[PDB]
Amino acid sequence: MNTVPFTSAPIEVTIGIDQYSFNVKENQPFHGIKDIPIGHVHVIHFQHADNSSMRYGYWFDCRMGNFYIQYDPKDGLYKMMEERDGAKFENIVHNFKERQMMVSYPKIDEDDTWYNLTEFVQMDKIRKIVRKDENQFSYVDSSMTTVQENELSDPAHSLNYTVINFKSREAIRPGHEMEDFLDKSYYLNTVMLQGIFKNSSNYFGELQFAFLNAMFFGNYGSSLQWHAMIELICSSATVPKHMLDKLDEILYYQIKTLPEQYSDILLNERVWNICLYSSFQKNSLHNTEKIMENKYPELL
Amino acid sequence: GAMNSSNYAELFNNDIKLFVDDTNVYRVTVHKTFEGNVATKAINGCIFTLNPKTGHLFLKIIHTSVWAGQKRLSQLAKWKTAEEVSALVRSLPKEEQPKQIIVTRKAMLDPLEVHMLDFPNIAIRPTELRLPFSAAMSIDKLSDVVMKATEPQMVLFNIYDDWLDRISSYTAFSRLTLLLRALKTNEESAKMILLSDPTITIKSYHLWPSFTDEQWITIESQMRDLILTEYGRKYNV
Ligand SMILES: CC(C)OCc1ccc(C(=O)O)cc1
Known part of the structure; x- marks a missing residue:
């Protein structure tokens, strides 16, 4: 178990840690989150009570170091910092009184949700999408645009997702215009899987990360990327069987976790009706189709 | 963007533009079989590509042989139109290539955009103008050249004569x-x-x-x- 201590909580805030969230009042005696599994990946996110604009947060992996949160009264946000002096950190986190003012990561044992949602997500790939090499953790917020969006305005503060554009030369072989636009298998298998991602696990990792940034931060470009990566698979007549089966499970848990009141803003009616009811893979998403129909029949 | 009538005069500025109408590309007669069924028979068609400023009409004759052994012909016809328009643009000297192509049917947008990826600076757009170019085959000399064709063919006309x-x-x-x-x-x-x-x-x-x-x-x-x-x-x- 690891601990993400907080120096203080000077401003009232809603704090998320992975799929959980709780509130902290202004200047409440709150010193952090205790009992976190080392895991492979985590996210801590914030939405200020007095200004719900800018949700923001940090992706991190406890294995890569000791992370703590300190509020910065100049920039006005809770900042993640790393302590390299592990003994000093162990001394602060040992502290029995400090632990009394910390909330415990509250994982039900039957609950494997967090890991179903992040199975393919790895910190080293996050750090390639979110470029800030001097930190081991990665900052994302509601307003950050994607590199692709920027091409249609600060490349430092951007989300470097893999560009997917169905009406581009990368997606369309000269001489195969109709073929490749109607059946995106070339673009999926040769360009993306063999060329860029190298395997389906890395593809799914970016798809999972995009989903989670859209859900936790309301990041619009992330939502666009999640939907595009889904549509690329579904619009391909030729897809490995293992990948289709795994896609059904990935999407099932994403749809299951989605806030029910957030379906108008996080689900694109067009894409999902194409994928479930019209595409080459309509029949390969049995569990996803079943949860969507019973949970969100209005969208369909 | 979509064209219409606030900017009807813009059609006649100095930016080269082409209208593309695909409504006569795939044409059929409908007739009853021996068993009693009904069957289509394709007849020659044409792509209607017009420069509205100069009157130059690039009439690509679509010979019925291009449909042989193909499925989903209404869909194919759009991609075939897009293939031929892209070929036309590529055949033109750069200073004669259009800055905009205006399609009379929105269903042509994606086929043409995909075939024109080599020309990112050529805008492909629909229009809110309802135009009667489907009646091009009522012009006797155009209908004659389409129906007499025994192979694919491109024929140039000035649809304004000497006006x-x-x-x-x-x-x-x-x-x-x-x-x-x-x-x-x-x-x-x-x-x-x-x-x-x-x-x-x-x-x-x-x-x-x-x-x-x-x-x-x-x-x-x-x-x-x-x-x-x-x-x-x-x-x-
Ligand atoms: C519980 C206590 C207030 O945590 C604050 C905090 C701040 C810094 C560090 C460090 O740098 O070692 C560790 C913990």
């Missing part, structure tokens, strides 16, 4: 769409209007009769009357 010697491109395009709307609305009566007088002939190198300026005013009036008469008949006005 630009005397009127503006704006006026010529208005005359053309009036004529074509009348042909679409009541083809046999529109042809009677145009051909009723044997002393006004069609030059060997023209599509329309050699009307004088005053005769064109009269013809245009008779075409407007034809269109209004048919409106009244249709809606019992």
Whole structure:
């Protein structure tokens, strides 16, 4: 178990840690989150009570170091910092009184949700999408645009997702215009899987990360990327069987976790009706189709 | 963006633009089989690609052999149109390539954009103008060359004949769409209007009769009357 201590909580805030969230009042005696599994990946996110604009947060992996949160009264946000002096950190986190003012990561044992949602997500790939090499953790917020969006305005503060554009030369072989636009298998298998991602696990990792940034931060470009990566698979007549089966499970848990009141803003009616009811893979998403129909029949 | 009538004059600025109409690419007759079924038979068609400023019409004849052994022909026809328009653009010297291609049917947008990826600076757009280019096959010389073709063929016409010697491109395009709307609305009566007088002939190198300026005013009036008469008949006005 690891601990993400907080120096203080000077401003009232809603704090998320992975799929959980709780509130902290202004200047409440709150010193952090205790009992976190080392895991492979985590996210801590914030939405200020007095200004719900800018949700923001940090992706991190406890294995890569000791992370703590300190509020910065100049920039006005809770900042993640790393302590390299592990003994000093162990001394602060040992502290029995400090632990009394910390909330415990509250994982039900039957609950494997967090890991179903992040199975393919790895910190080293996050750090390639979110470029800030001097930190081991990665900052994302509601307003950050994607590199692709920027091409249609600060490349430092951007989300470097893999560009997917169905009406581009990368997606369309000269001489195969109709073929490749109607059946995106070339673009999926040769360009993306063999060329860029190298395997389906890395593809799914970016798809999972995009989903989670859209859900936790309301990041619009992330939502666009999640939907595009889904549509690329579904619009391909030729897809490995293992990948289709795994896609059904990935999407099932994403749809299951989605806030029910957030379906108008996080689900694109067009894409999902194409994928479930019209595409080459309509029949390969049995569990996803079943949860969507019973949970969100209005969208369909 | 989508074109219309606030910017109707813009069609005649100096940016080269082409209209593309695909409504006569895939054409069929519908007839009953021996077993009693009904069967289609394709007949030759054409892509109608027009420069509205100059009158230059690039008529690509679509021979029925291109459909042989193909499925989903309505869908294929859009991609075939897009293939041929892209080929036309590539065949043109750079200074003659359009800055905009305006498709009369929105279903042409994605096929054409995908075939024109090599030309990112060429805008591909629909229009809110309802244009009567589907009546192009009512122009006898165009219909003749399409129906006589035994192989794919491209034929160049000036759909304004020599009118630009005397009127503006704006006026010529208005005359053309009036004529074509009348042909679409009541083809046999529109042809009677145009051909009723044997002393006004069609030059060997023209599509329309050699009307004088005053005769064109009269013809245009008779075409407007034809269109209004048919409106009244249709809606019992
Ligand atoms: C519980 C206590 C207030 O945590 C604050 C905090 C701040 C810094 C560090 C460090 O740098 O070692 C560790 C913990």
